Design a protein around this nucleic acid. Structure first.
Ligand SMILES: [Mg+2]
Ligand SMILES: [Mg+2]
Ligand SMILES: [Mg+2]
Ligand SMILES: [Mg+2]
Ligand SMILES: [Mg+2]
Ligand SMILES: [Mg+2]
Ligand SMILES: [Mg+2]
Ligand SMILES: [Mg+2]
Ligand SMILES: [Mg+2]
Ligand SMILES: [Mg+2]
Ligand SMILES: [Mg+2]
Ligand SMILES: [Mg+2]
Ligand SMILES: [Mg+2]
Ligand SMILES: [Mg+2]
Ligand SMILES: [Mg+2]
Ligand SMILES: [Mg+2]
Ligand SMILES: [Mg+2]
Ligand SMILES: [Mg+2]
Ligand SMILES: [Mg+2]
Ligand SMILES: [Mg+2]
Ligand SMILES: [Mg+2]
Ligand SMILES: [Mg+2]
Ligand SMILES: [Mg+2]
Ligand SMILES: [Mg+2]
Ligand SMILES: [Mg+2]
Ligand SMILES: [Mg+2]
Ligand SMILES: [Mg+2]
Ligand SMILES: [Mg+2]
Ligand SMILES: [Mg+2]
Ligand SMILES: [Mg+2]
Ligand SMILES: [Mg+2]
Ligand SMILES: [Mg+2]
Ligand SMILES: [Mg+2]
Ligand SMILES: [Mg+2]
Ligand SMILES: [Mg+2]
Ligand SMILES: [Mg+2]
Ligand SMILES: [Mg+2]
Ligand SMILES: [Mg+2]
Ligand SMILES: [Mg+2]
Ligand SMILES: [Mg+2]
Ligand SMILES: [Mg+2]
Ligand SMILES: [Mg+2]
Ligand SMILES: [Mg+2]
Ligand SMILES: [Mg+2]
Ligand SMILES: [Mg+2]
Ligand SMILES: [Mg+2]
Ligand SMILES: [Mg+2]
Ligand SMILES: [Mg+2]
Ligand SMILES: [Mg+2]
Ligand SMILES: [Mg+2]
Ligand SMILES: [Mg+2]
Ligand SMILES: [Mg+2]
Ligand SMILES: [Mg+2]
Ligand SMILES: [Mg+2]
Ligand SMILES: [Mg+2]
Ligand SMILES: [Mg+2]
Ligand SMILES: [Mg+2]
Ligand SMILES: [Mg+2]
Ligand SMILES: [Mg+2]
Ligand SMILES: [Mg+2]
Ligand SMILES: [Mg+2]
Ligand SMILES: [Mg+2]
Ligand SMILES: [Mg+2]
Ligand SMILES: [Mg+2]
Ligand SMILES: [Mg+2]
Ligand SMILES: [Mg+2]
Ligand SMILES: [Mg+2]
Ligand SMILES: [Mg+2]
Ligand SMILES: [Mg+2]
Ligand SMILES: [Mg+2]
Ligand SMILES: [Mg+2]
Ligand SMILES: [Mg+2]
Ligand SMILES: [Mg+2]
Ligand SMILES: [Mg+2]
Ligand SMILES: [Mg+2]
Ligand SMILES: [Mg+2]
Ligand SMILES: [Mg+2]
Ligand SMILES: [Mg+2]
Ligand SMILES: [Mg+2]
Ligand SMILES: [Mg+2]
Ligand SMILES: [Mg+2]
Ligand SMILES: [Mg+2]
Ligand SMILES: [Mg+2]
Ligand SMILES: [Mg+2]
Ligand SMILES: [Mg+2]
Ligand SMILES: [Mg+2]
Ligand SMILES: [Mg+2]
Ligand SMILES: [Mg+2]
Ligand SMILES: [Mg+2]
Ligand SMILES: [Mg+2]
Ligand SMILES: [Mg+2]
Ligand SMILES: [Mg+2]
Ligand SMILES: [Mg+2]
Ligand SMILES: [Mg+2]
Ligand SMILES: [Mg+2]
Ligand SMILES: [Mg+2]
Ligand SMILES: [Mg+2]
Ligand SMILES: [Mg+2]
Ligand SMILES: [Mg+2]
Ligand SMILES: [Mg+2]
Ligand SMILES: [Mg+2]
Ligand SMILES: [Mg+2]
Ligand SMILES: [Mg+2]
Ligand SMILES: [Mg+2]
Ligand SMILES: [Mg+2]
Ligand SMILES: [Mg+2]
Ligand SMILES: [Mg+2]
Ligand SMILES: [Mg+2]
Ligand SMILES: [Mg+2]
Ligand SMILES: [Mg+2]
Ligand SMILES: [Mg+2]
Ligand SMILES: [Mg+2]
Ligand SMILES: [Mg+2]
Ligand SMILES: [Mg+2]
Ligand SMILES: [Mg+2]
Ligand SMILES: [Mg+2]
Ligand SMILES: [Mg+2]
Ligand SMILES: [Mg+2]
Ligand SMILES: [Mg+2]
Ligand SMILES: [Mg+2]
Ligand SMILES: [Mg+2]
Ligand SMILES: [Mg+2]
Ligand SMILES: [Mg+2]
Ligand SMILES: [Mg+2]
Ligand SMILES: [Mg+2]
Ligand SMILES: [Mg+2]
Ligand SMILES: [Mg+2]
Ligand SMILES: [Mg+2]
Ligand SMILES: [Mg+2]
Ligand SMILES: [Mg+2]
Ligand SMILES: [Mg+2]
Ligand SMILES: [Mg+2]
Ligand SMILES: [Mg+2]
Ligand SMILES: [Mg+2]
Ligand SMILES: [Mg+2]
Ligand SMILES: [Mg+2]
Ligand SMILES: [Mg+2]
Ligand SMILES: [Mg+2]
Ligand SMILES: [Mg+2]
Ligand SMILES: [Mg+2]
Ligand SMILES: [Mg+2]
Ligand SMILES: [Mg+2]
Ligand SMILES: [Mg+2]
Ligand SMILES: [Mg+2]
Ligand SMILES: [Mg+2]
Ligand SMILES: [Mg+2]
Ligand SMILES: [Mg+2]
Lengths: 97, 146
RNA sequence: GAGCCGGUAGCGGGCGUGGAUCCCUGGAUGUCCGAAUGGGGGAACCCGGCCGGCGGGAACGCCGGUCACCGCGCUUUUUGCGCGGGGGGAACCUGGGGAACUGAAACAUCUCAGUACCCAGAGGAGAGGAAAGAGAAAUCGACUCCCUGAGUAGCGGCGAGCGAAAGGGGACCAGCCUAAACCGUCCGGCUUGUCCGGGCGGGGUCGUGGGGCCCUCGGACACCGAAUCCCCAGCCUAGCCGA
RNA sequence: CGUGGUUCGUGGAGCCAUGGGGGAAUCUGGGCGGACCACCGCCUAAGGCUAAGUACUCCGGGUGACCGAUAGCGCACCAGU
RNA sequence: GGCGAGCUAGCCCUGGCCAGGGUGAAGCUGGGGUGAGACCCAGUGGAGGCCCGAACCGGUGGGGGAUGCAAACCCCUCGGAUGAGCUGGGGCUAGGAGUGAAAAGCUAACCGAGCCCGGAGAUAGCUGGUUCUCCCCGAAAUGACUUUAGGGUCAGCCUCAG
RNA sequence: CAGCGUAGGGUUAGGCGGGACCUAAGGUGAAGCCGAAAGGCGUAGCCGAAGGGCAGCCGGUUAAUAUUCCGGCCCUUCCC
RNA sequence: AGCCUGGUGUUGGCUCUUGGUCGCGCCUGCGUAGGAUAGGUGGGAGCCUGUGAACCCCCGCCUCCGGGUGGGGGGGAGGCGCCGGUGAAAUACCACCCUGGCGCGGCUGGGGGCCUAACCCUCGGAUGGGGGGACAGCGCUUGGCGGGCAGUUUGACUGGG
RNA sequence: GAAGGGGGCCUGACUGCGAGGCCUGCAAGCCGAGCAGGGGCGAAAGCCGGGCCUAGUGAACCGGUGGUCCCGUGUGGAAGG
RNA sequence: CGCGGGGUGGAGCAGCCCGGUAGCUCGUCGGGCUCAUAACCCGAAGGUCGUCGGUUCAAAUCCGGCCCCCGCAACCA
């Protein structure tokens, strides 16, 4: 659950590569690798509290798609439900088709 | 980022000036405080619609005077009063100049705000002025007898 | 088509040409546990709500029915209703994760290997698939699969080792739906409008670029036609004749 | 910028994918032909579906220069006992 | 990747157990003492990881046992025995992990890294083993180089064909 | 002869124990939080006992059961 | 792994304060020496002033305090040079620039203070209040410390090693 | 009877090769006449491809530097070889 | 090899800027106070200012070639 609620960006797995030596393109004999290990790369997840209808709604999104939250907030049309307006603001209003 | 202001500020513009600012400012201050809204393609469209609405129902209000200015600024009404001599027993008020014109040429006016200041006594040829905004000077003759 | 009441004789009884046993298809019944789903729980036990029934029957007990959760849709947040999901399956498949021994006659990059294995998901298959492709021929035309190209091109502590594609030959054969411009409509927001937005319908789907809108021509009986529905042949699930 | 995929182990390193930052355009638009530039060409990304040819064998069948009870399945026998 | 704290270690919740005797702290009361005290003396009292010693928990020395009664036993002897005590029941923590008044102890009778299945037919320049018959020939235990020295590569020496 | 073979018989409860009671460690877990997936947390609640709560004592009887059957005396809860 | 750390995202408001670069504007500079307290080199018989000069008085800055230099003004028609020379140079002016300085704007960087509204904590009470506060936390990235952990290496000959 | 000492000019401490051999497990190491180019010393014959000789040494890989033709991923370049 | 500094007298060392003193301390000598030496006072010694060539009227200055010592920073088949 470290996944963007809007873009669906979720942590990926990537290698940390320890290289040493002078580049070849700088008259070095070339680079050498002293280790390769796995690590996660998490999306830059942040909270976005935004007031909709009468309720406060909180999105967990990548900083990158924060704009999308407020665009999803513009679309307004009758909905006095529970703290679950996002259920409606969500994919219901994302791409739908 | 560009937003549409919904109020004068000092620090930005006023009531409709599309001005860009830090998205942080927008998200955590303006928008939440109704202080403004985002320059959406929609919101921007609806703003032009906003501007045209006024500019129309406004340039129409001026097209109401410039019209009622012409039918009035040249035609003259007569006020026959128990004048005695150069000093009316009664007095023609703005309220009167109204009723008069309503038949003497058949139009309606204020009758308030007419630059009336104090009911007019005595006789002669008077030139007053009217409204609203860029206006018209009405001419009228206070006479004598019935 | 004459025997039968399983392996299984026996004791003690019965059934069959009025067609039994047996075989195939369909249906009925189907305790309790188990995804297990009224609630508990140390699976196969225990304890309930609601409606109905049974016993003299209020207390008690039994019988039938019903009551988990989650998602989607309607719908008035009401409150309901409908639909679905859940779990399992030899191997096969895709995805998310992902070793080490070992090899390098030591060892760390490299190897083993995206293997073993864990997890999720799918289905009789799964994936993939209709060019923002190939790549030097003014060339070819979705994808999958086999042969070949080829141990080539390359990759590589240039070590150990790793190892393509185009093209050619085959199998199979298929191509479609949308989003948007534009138009109609219902609805909601309001700082009421040739306003914005959402919902449905029409429209449109392309690479010799395509579509929308405007005008002109002539725009049609047609002509193509399913991967959908329907019918049928054929096939599977018992058998029969057979010198 | 950080990585994965490809034969490509940073290599002249493109292409496809994308965790981070910045961030367009709508045919005179964009991507690609292995850094880059020009020229000449190829193709139209950011929506979706799509039979068949393919993989497997719990299951039924048919075959064997396959075994024949220390073999063949762990089990020919009430054995995952 | 799973299975294990029904053994053992620690901890958490709720219970239970400790014959009998001995020593006699404080405090208390009274008396003496003083300006008032400290304090002293009696009696009372009944404290303590206090004493002796069963149950209970131990495991000191010796003998026995040694294909045992027993894969930790038996006899005699010995330590603790109101406490950091013993113990039933219900729980929690684990494999580079737990738990440990600390021995690398213990984590289901072998723990310097548990068990099971799997990768797996790991690898083993080492050791052992390698099955009918007859015929002909018939070595080597040296040189070079080798993280090489009981292993190899080339040469040397054997054999077969032309 | 047997704790062995074959066969037949034998375990009787409103009050004893446990359950249509309670909570403990802990476990589970509407709300909620977190995590690539598996899953990990977690308020209330629920589960959880050798703790709390709750009404039976003395005899007789069978080859074998008895606070269970019987006899005597004595109590609990529910319904009306 | 963990921990420290720069850049950047989340991340906003208001200020004061500074640096780099650039354009422009105005000053900046000393050797007797020429008559002097003329920065390099050019152009240069011309000028400057009656679009108010020198001579003075408040004024600011610079100073080798010698003077340099404008602003306010009393001021009312002069005020410079070449020339001649005990000096590389000539010293009206129009210039292109050097060195450094202030000034204005431009593109960027650094710091400090205050604010609150993200983010965090807290308040039997919340659409809110209080505290912290664009810090901290967290994402990506930089470099470092790093037996806490991990994988390994740690030669052969040798009158045994 | 110089390989030793002295002086004069000079740079063959050449380029392109190399018959044939020494040694030798491989790979190496060694000697080398002669031809060609263009030279040096010498009247000449001739000698000269470092040093009286035998130690003064390091496979490959990976890179640096200067050249040069050669390859240059559709083509001209460029990157890189 | 790459980047940055410079050697001044016997020593370190200011003059390196807007081209112009080729300085200060200790050591030794001369001289006086000191019963004394040192302290302490007076004066004085030694610089073609790392190399050469340049742009200016010169120059330690600025450029450039040059040389090592020191300084900095990588790489090593
Ligand atoms: Mg890294
Ligand atoms: Mg190069
Ligand atoms: Mg590895
Ligand atoms: Mg962004
Ligand atoms: Mg039977
Ligand atoms: Mg019978
Ligand atoms: Mg009969
Ligand atoms: Mg029949
Ligand atoms: Mg049936
Ligand atoms: Mg049925
Ligand atoms: Mg149940
Ligand atoms: Mg009923
Ligand atoms: Mg029922
Ligand atoms: Mg399904
Ligand atoms: Mg399933
Ligand atoms: Mg499952
Ligand atoms: Mg995968
Ligand atoms: Mg996989
Ligand atoms: Mg997944
Ligand atoms: Mg993976
Ligand atoms: Mg390995
Ligand atoms: Mg091998
Ligand atoms: Mg190995
Ligand atoms: Mg090996
Ligand atoms: Mg080893
Ligand atoms: Mg691999
Ligand atoms: Mg599965
Ligand atoms: Mg098929
Ligand atoms: Mg399919
Ligand atoms: Mg598909
Ligand atoms: Mg298409
Ligand atoms: Mg095409
Ligand atoms: Mg190479
Ligand atoms: Mg591979
Ligand atoms: Mg092909
Ligand atoms: Mg083909
Ligand atoms: Mg086709
Ligand atoms: Mg509309
Ligand atoms: Mg539509
Ligand atoms: Mg449509
Ligand atoms: Mg349509
Ligand atoms: Mg067109
Ligand atoms: Mg027959
Ligand atoms: Mg026959
Ligand atoms: Mg990238
Ligand atoms: Mg890669
Ligand atoms: Mg490499
Ligand atoms: Mg390379
Ligand atoms: Mg690449
Ligand atoms: Mg790559
Ligand atoms: Mg390109
Ligand atoms: Mg890319
Ligand atoms: Mg990206
Ligand atoms: Mg184009
Ligand atoms: Mg291409
Ligand atoms: Mg190209
Ligand atoms: Mg680049
Ligand atoms: Mg193409
Ligand atoms: Mg498409
Ligand atoms: Mg498909
Ligand atoms: Mg079969
Ligand atoms: Mg047979
Ligand atoms: Mg047998
Ligand atoms: Mg067998
Ligand atoms: Mg036999
Ligand atoms: Mg089988
Ligand atoms: Mg067997
Ligand atoms: Mg069996
Ligand atoms: Mg594990
Ligand atoms: Mg235990
Ligand atoms: Mg007892
Ligand atoms: Mg006692
Ligand atoms: Mg007393
Ligand atoms: Mg007393
Ligand atoms: Mg006593
Ligand atoms: Mg006492
Ligand atoms: Mg004691
Ligand atoms: Mg004792
Ligand atoms: Mg004792
Ligand atoms: Mg004792
Ligand atoms: Mg004793
Ligand atoms: Mg003992
Ligand atoms: Mg002992
Ligand atoms: Mg002993
Ligand atoms: Mg003994
Ligand atoms: Mg003994
Ligand atoms: Mg003995
Ligand atoms: Mg004892
Ligand atoms: Mg205690
Ligand atoms: Mg206990
Ligand atoms: Mg372990
Ligand atoms: Mg440990
Ligand atoms: Mg202990
Ligand atoms: Mg043990
Ligand atoms: Mg293996
Ligand atoms: Mg090994
Ligand atoms: Mg022979
Ligand atoms: Mg012989
Ligand atoms: Mg060996
Ligand atoms: Mg050999
Ligand atoms: Mg022969
Ligand atoms: Mg018996
Ligand atoms: Mg009773
Ligand atoms: Mg009892
Ligand atoms: Mg009870
Ligand atoms: Mg009941
Ligand atoms: Mg309870
Ligand atoms: Mg839990
Ligand atoms: Mg969960
Ligand atoms: Mg979940
Ligand atoms: Mg209960
Ligand atoms: Mg109880
Ligand atoms: Mg009790
Ligand atoms: Mg009871
Ligand atoms: Mg009683
Ligand atoms: Mg008995
Ligand atoms: Mg009795
Ligand atoms: Mg009774
Ligand atoms: Mg940081
Ligand atoms: Mg920041
Ligand atoms: Mg500034
Ligand atoms: Mg200028
Ligand atoms: Mg605050
Ligand atoms: Mg607050
Ligand atoms: Mg505050
Ligand atoms: Mg921060
Ligand atoms: Mg780091
Ligand atoms: Mg490091
Ligand atoms: Mg270690
Ligand atoms: Mg280290
Ligand atoms: Mg290893
Ligand atoms: Mg050795
Ligand atoms: Mg020896
Ligand atoms: Mg010896
Ligand atoms: Mg000589
Ligand atoms: Mg000579
Ligand atoms: Mg030869
Ligand atoms: Mg040699
Ligand atoms: Mg020599
Ligand atoms: Mg190598
Ligand atoms: Mg190279
Ligand atoms: Mg090379
Ligand atoms: Mg070429
Ligand atoms: Mg190509
Ligand atoms: Mg090219
Ligand atoms: Mg090169
Ligand atoms: Mg080259």
């Amino acid at each position: 659950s470290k996944v963007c609620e809007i873009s669906g960006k979720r942590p990926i797995v990537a290698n940390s590569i320890q290289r040493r030596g002078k580049a070849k393109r700088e008259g070095g004999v070339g680079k050498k690798t002293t280790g390769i290990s796995k690590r996660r790369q998490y999306p830059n997840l942040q909270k976005v509290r935004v007031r909709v209808a009468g309720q406060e709604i909180t999105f967990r999104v990548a900083a990158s798609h924060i704009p999308k939250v407020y665009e999803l907030v513009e679309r307004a049309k009758g909905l006095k439900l529970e703290g679950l307006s996002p259920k409606e603001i969500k994919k219901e209003l994302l791409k739908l088709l | 980022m560009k937003v549409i202001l919904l109020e004068p500020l000092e620090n930005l513009g006023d009531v409709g000036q599309v001005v860009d600012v830090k998205p942080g400012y927008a998200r955590n201050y303006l928008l939440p405080r109704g202080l403004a809204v985002l320059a959406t393609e929609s919101n921007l469209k609806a703003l032009e619609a906003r501007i045209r609405a006024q500019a129309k129902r406004l340039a129409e209000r001026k097209a109401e005077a410039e019209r009622l200015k012409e039918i009035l600024e040249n035609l003259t009404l007569t006020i026959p009063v128990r004048a005695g001599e150069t000093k009316i027993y009664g007095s023609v008020t703005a309220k009167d100049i109204a009723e008069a014109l309503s038949r003497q040429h058949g139009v309606t006016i204020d009758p308030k705000r007419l630059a009336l200041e104090k009911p007019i006594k005595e006789l002669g040829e008077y030139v007053l002025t009217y409204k609203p905004h860029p206006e018209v000077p009405i001419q009228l003759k206070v006479s004598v007898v019935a």
